[PDB]
Write a protein that binds this ligand. Structure first.
Ligand SMILES: NC(=O)C1=CN([C@@H]2O[C@H](COP(=O)(O)OP(=O)(O)OC[C@H]3O[C@@H](n4cnc5c(N)ncnc54)[C@H](OP(=O)(O)O)[C@@H]3O)[C@@H](O)[C@H]2O)C=CC1
Ligand SMILES: NC(=O)C1=CN([C@@H]2O[C@H](COP(=O)(O)OP(=O)(O)OC[C@H]3O[C@@H](n4cnc5c(N)ncnc54)[C@H](OP(=O)(O)O)[C@@H]3O)[C@@H](O)[C@H]2O)C=CC1
Ligand SMILES: NC(=O)C1=CN([C@@H]2O[C@H](COP(=O)(O)OP(=O)(O)OC[C@H]3O[C@@H](n4cnc5c(N)ncnc54)[C@H](OP(=O)(O)O)[C@@H]3O)[C@@H](O)[C@H]2O)C=CC1
Lengths: 961, 105, 52
């Protein structure tokens, strides 16, 4: 009966390809793997082959993800109920996959006819190649191997492409799902959990396959999100539902972060590197020719203080003969113009030679070197008036901190938006779920960035005019200030306090929308409320008792029963039942005469929901404000609708996407309830804003009654304060950029260029100028640029070369055309590798054009005509810090960049040089290096955010093995 | 049509299509789909831009009922007029309610 | 059986099995323990479905 499948991932095993299905460092069994395993079981039951068995899957539900270990095997048991057409895949007795599987009795080829695209594709020549597609997917968290890299070509929108057929159904349908999720605006690891239907007809799949000039069979795939289908070959996946699986915090990327700082302490051959034509390189090769007399090689640069021969020496030491030549730099890096300027023809050179140090740098009278120190692990805390509460590590209440908000670095002023100082912010159930990790941030409607914190849905405080207001926000309510439309604000009455009013908006808006707008509750209607002692429960009780409705409330303890009795004296002893059990249903049906309750405001889950459905009377209204059964697609027997029953799915969040007159109805209802005294503030347990973590855990334990409120600011005694400015508090520094400023990324069309541009967009950048020599070539670049442009960002792709001073001037002018230049990023790079022997001065010139001369010109033009510049960042390499074989010119250019940044920072202007190691998932090293793994790009962006708020001139980020 | 609404009528014949077109000139060629198969769903999902319909007056059953449910937009109203699926207690996936959908028996 | 308290849930009877005067009716009971479900069939035709 139960077909056993011992999935083994060994090399000799036939299922070794499953090793290539990696999702965030874990080998997961694909959902299409379950589809194929059930297909095999059904073919065996019917005595057919999979290639001869057109099959239909329906209501496929994935209940857990199977971990395929590196060593060992996993047994999956498939059981078929042929009479009910159902199947069941289980692992070690635990249900894994459920659904209906049945042979397609009448396979219709017309089903696998690709739907017409909603709009024609204009960028037909520019498509996403296989490498680009899977680099993007790896950025999203799918570390797919070659076996599952079946997408050879895909359109920019992700609505069409071609899938490579390797005679493997698992890989084919997995790449089908990859194509479906490729054009997904949501970011993160999205794994399928439900599929409505999957029709596989191998007969027409063979016909649909066609072969390219590579002699590889491919199938055209079309993803129609309008129809919510994916059609490829003879596979049709309709109603695919994917949920965002959180990425495990057990990431091996624990980067080493360091600071690069100046630290005071035969026949000699002098090599002057001060020449700008690099003609000395050949002479340096001559120095490498000798062996005995080459021991005292003194490589000195005395003209330019930003020579940057540090990386040159560090890399040349790694090359053969460098240690024997003892190549050591004598760099006169005087940060200030008023400097001693030690003469290298005096006794100072003799003392330096006697010391025989590996490096000698003269810094304002200090004879030292450049050294790496461990960066302090303490996050940079700054005093700001605009901060929000965020969980630094998801699912950990201990890592709850105040971090700087986007409002302080970017102050917006426009009609229809109001910046309100927050004195009190009420923690909600969704906030606890977000902080504890039980709720995915992507589940909340709205365009939220990856680094966005959505804690807080409710606040009270003072608006810009100083009026005492209380507001309902989609997210970010746990902030010292919020930016919300005035349509979501209510005036706090004089008799109320800000602490009292902080509990009203979310709870009473939810109750009013459920009961009046949706439930249409009439006076005198018997009504059941689940979790009556809770906020929404209490508001529903107040609204129902305002209408004189008989109320049955479910509570979880005797203390909550007593509190509800005291708070609402209209409730008798027969109005209370148990919410932790199902018995409430009997109670209700005993006290309503078996008729039922006209309305059921239900926030309970699983069978407690179904019992609440059983409590419904004829013409009953079931308002489901809970989410567990809604998110799980749990079955609901529709025979209840034989009672003329209405079933409302009440979500208040849908009011933050349109905010039309439908929300204005709820706003008017809440205002009328406030005026009439129906809306009464709940009991508030107040925790000081300096300690939000204890509030979070206290409300998580669930013994709280009413509302839990964090006091961001104590309410001063007054009616309308003219100032109403938030008080200064210490918060973790976070990099944000004004929307009115333009930012330049040199080489922003490159890999790290595009990723940093996206990160800046997520940090509030609205004006971007990415400069590249060749313009837009690859499909990935075009897709990213057009996505940012559709997002509303002013992205300019310029061809101005920062190598030439005129080019840098034109680039800065183009940026200033968009807006004042707030930041310049130097990521432009050309690589001319090779040992010192097979190295030419022209290669040095080419490698230093973007980095050395480019940073010269950027610094000069920013000094001349960028008074308001906030960021001057350049990307150097750890090859400068320590040394790389065959990359002497790269190290020299990086060291020159670092010297430029150090001089800029010493003078007072912004300056930052980031010594990046191997860069993962994106870059040049992807299109173990020097003992360092490629740092994943998310970690790179986190480290860059850390570095951008540091006072150190040069910092390095690299991951050891 | 009195309320000036966009209407998608599912009929199972071409003669029914012609009679509906003659009776209600406000209906266009895109207003008609097929009631004898699930296909109408796609038709609706094509002509609503994937948004779906605000109200479903469903008298069909089984897979046609499920397809009609899948046609609901956000804040959609599903008015069950038929009784087969109601009488048989057929399970209804409780995830359409995540679109602020109200189900009317 | 007498040592096993049991719970049936959502039991549905799709058709009635007529026991012949002479002969025998074969009833197939299949259990999905992980799904906690059961199925009773007569000749491959679904007769009873539910959870147990
Ligand atoms: N659909 C929508 O738009 C909205 C939905 N909601 C949902 O409505 C539900 C109720 O809202 P709300 O009253 O504010 O939630 P609350 O924390 O205020 O209380 C909800 C009830 O959940 C019960 N509960 C049981 N165990 C726990 C626990 N471990 N932690 C916390 N509570 C527990 C408690 O009641 P008891 O012990 O007596 O059973 C608690 O009173 C929430 O789940 C919330 O997510 C809220 C706002 C809007
Ligand atoms: N990726 C990595 O592993 C590491 C990267 N870094 C730093 O990361 C930064 C980004 O490099 P990378 O990740 O490799 O991205 P890419 O190397 O893929 O992109 C390099 C970009 O440099 C552009 N470029 C070079 N010179 C100029 C110029 N004079 N004007 C305009 N554009 C220019 C090139 O433009 P065009 O399109 O015309 O070629 C190219 O697009 C570099 O500064 C690099 O030093 C540091 C250490 C490691
Ligand atoms: N719940 C309630 O309150 C009420 C419900 N109803 C329900 O409305 C539904 C339809 O009622 P109503 O529209 O008046 O019926 P009609 O006789 O006027 O036609 C019903 C439609 O159903 C289709 N149909 C499918 N099979 C048949 C069949 N064997 N004979 C005739 N027509 C068929 C036809 O459309 P097509 O063939 O093109 O598919 C037909 O046009 C019924 O299920 C009925 O139970 C009616 C009154 C009240």
């Amino acid at each position: 009966s139960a077909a056993i499948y011992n999935i083994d991932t060994s090399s000799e095993s036939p299922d070794h390809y499953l090793v290539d299905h990696t999702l965030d460092g874990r080998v997961l069994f694909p959902a299409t793997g379950y589809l194929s395993i059930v297909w095999k079981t059904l073919a065996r039951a019917l005595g057919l082959g999979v290639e001869q068995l057109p099959v239909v899957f329906e209501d496929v539900v994935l209940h857990q993800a199977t971990i395929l270990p590196k060593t060992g095997t996993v047994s999956l048991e498939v059981r078929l109920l042929e009479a009910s057409r159902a199947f069941e895949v289980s692992e070690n007795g635990n249900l894994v996959v459920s659904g209906k599987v049945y042979q397609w009795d009448d396979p219709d080829p017309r089903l696998f006819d690709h739907p017409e695209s909603p709009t024609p594709n204009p960028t037909e020549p520019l498509f996403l190649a296989q490498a680009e597609v899977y680099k993007e997917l790896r950025l999203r968290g799918y570390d797919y191997g070659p076996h599952f890299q079946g997408i050879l070509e895909a359109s920019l929108e992700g609505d069409s492409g071609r899938l490579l057929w390797k005679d493997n159904w698992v890989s084919f349908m997995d790449t089908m799902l990859q194509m479906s999720i490729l054009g997904s605006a949501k970011h993160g690891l999205y794994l399928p959990t439900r599929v409505t239907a999957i029709h596989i007809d191998p007969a027409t799949h063979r016909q649909k396959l066609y072969t390219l000039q590579d002699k590889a069979q491919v199938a055209d795939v079309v993803v129609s999100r309008w129809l919510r289908v994916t059609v490829a070959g003879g596979v049709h996946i309709s109603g695919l539902h994917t949920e965002s699986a959180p990425r495990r915090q057990q990431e091996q990327q624990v980067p080493i972060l360091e600071k690069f700082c100046f630290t005071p302490h035969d026949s000699p051959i002098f090599l002057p590197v001060d020449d700008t034509s690099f003609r000395w390189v050949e002479s340096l090769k001559g120095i490498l020719a000798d062996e005995d007399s080459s021991r005292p090689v003194w490589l000195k640069a005395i003209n330019c203080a930003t020579s940057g021969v540090v990386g040159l020496v560090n890399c040349l030491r790694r090359e053969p003969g460098g240690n024997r030549l003892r190549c050591v730099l004598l760099s006169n890096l005087s940060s200030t113009s008023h400097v001693p300027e030690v003469d290298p023809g005096s006794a100072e050179l003799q003392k330096v030679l006697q010391g025989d140090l590996v490096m000698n740098v003269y810094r304002d009278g200090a004879w030292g070197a450049f050294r790496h120190f461990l960066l302090e692990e303490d996050k940079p805390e700054e005093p700001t008036a605009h901060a929000f509460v965020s969980t630094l590590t998801r699912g950990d209440l201990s890592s709850i901190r105040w971090v700087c908000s986007s409002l302080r670095h970017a102050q917006p002023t426009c009609p229809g938006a109001q910046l309100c100082t927050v004195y009190y912010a009420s923690l909600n159930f969704r906030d606890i779920m977000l902080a504890t990790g039980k709720l995915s941030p992507d589940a909340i409607p709205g365009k939220w960035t990856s680094q966005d914190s959505l804690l807080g849905m409710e606040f009270s405080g003072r608006d810009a005019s100083g009026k005492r207001v209380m507001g309902l926000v989609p997210a970010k309510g746990l902030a010292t200030s919020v930016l919300l439309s005035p349509d979501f604000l209510w005036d706090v009455p004089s008799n109320w306090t800000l602490e009292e009013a902080a509990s009203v908006p979310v709870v009473y808006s939810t109750a009013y929308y459920a009961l009046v707008v949706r439930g249409r509750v009439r006076p005198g209607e018997t009504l059941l409320i689940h979790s009556g002692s809770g906020g929404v429960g209490q508001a529903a009780i107040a609204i129902a008792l305002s209408l004189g409705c008989r109320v049955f409330t479910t509570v979880g303890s005797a203390e909550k029963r007593a509190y509800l009795q005291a708070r609402f004296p209209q409730l008798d002893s027969t109005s209370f039942a148990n919410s932790r059990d199902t018995s409430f249903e009997q109670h209700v049906l005993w006290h309503t005469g078996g008729k039922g309750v006209d309305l059921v405001l239900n926030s309970l889950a699983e069978e407690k929901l179904q019992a609440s459905v059983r409590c419904l009377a004829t013409h009953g209204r079931f308002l489901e404000i809970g989410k567990f059964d809604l998110s799980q697609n749990h079955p609901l027997g529709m025979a209840i609708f034989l009672k003329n029953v209405t079933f409302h799915g009440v979500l208040l969040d849908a009011f933050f996407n349109e905010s039309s007159a439908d929300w204005r109805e709820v706003w008017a209802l809440v205002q009328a309830g406030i005026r009439d005294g129906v809306v009464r503030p709940l009991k508030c347990t107040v925790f000081h804003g300096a300690q939000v973590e204890d509030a979070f855990r206290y409300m998580a334990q669930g013994k709280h009654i009413g509302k839990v409120v964090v006091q961001v600011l104590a309410e001063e005694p007054e009616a309308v304060l003219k100032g109403a400015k938030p008080k200064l508090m210490s918060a973790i520094s976070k990099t944000f950029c004004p929307a009115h400023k333009s930012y330049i990324i040199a080489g922003g069309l490159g890999g790290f260029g595009l990723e940093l541009a996206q990160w800046l967009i997520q940090r509030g950048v609205q004006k971007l100028v990415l400069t590249s020599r060749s313009g837009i070539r690859t499909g990935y670049q075009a897709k990213q640029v057009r996505r940012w442009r559709r997002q509303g960002v002013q992205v300019q792709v310029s061809t101005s070369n920062i190598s030439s001073l005129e080019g840098a001037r034109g680039l800065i002018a183009e940026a200033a055309q968009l807006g004042p230049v707030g930041g310049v990023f130097n990521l432009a790079v050309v690589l001319r590798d090779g040992l010192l022997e097979n190295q030419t001065p022209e290669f040095f010139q080419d490698v230093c054009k973007p980095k050395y001369s480019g940073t010269l010109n950027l610094d000069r033009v920013t000094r001349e005509a960028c008074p308001e510049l906030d960021y001057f960042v350049v990307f150097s390499s750890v090859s400068c810090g320590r040394g790389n074989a065959g990359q002497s010119n790269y190290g020299f250019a990086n060291s020159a960049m670092e010297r430029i940044c150090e001089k800029r920072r010493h003078e007072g202007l912004p300056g930052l040089a980031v010594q990046w190691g191997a860069i993962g998932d994106v870059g040049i090293l992807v299109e173990i290096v020097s003992g360092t793994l490629p740092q994943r790009m998310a970690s790179c962006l986190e480290v860059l955010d850390l570095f951008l708020n540091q006072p150190h001139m040069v910092l390095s980020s690299f991951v050891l093995a």
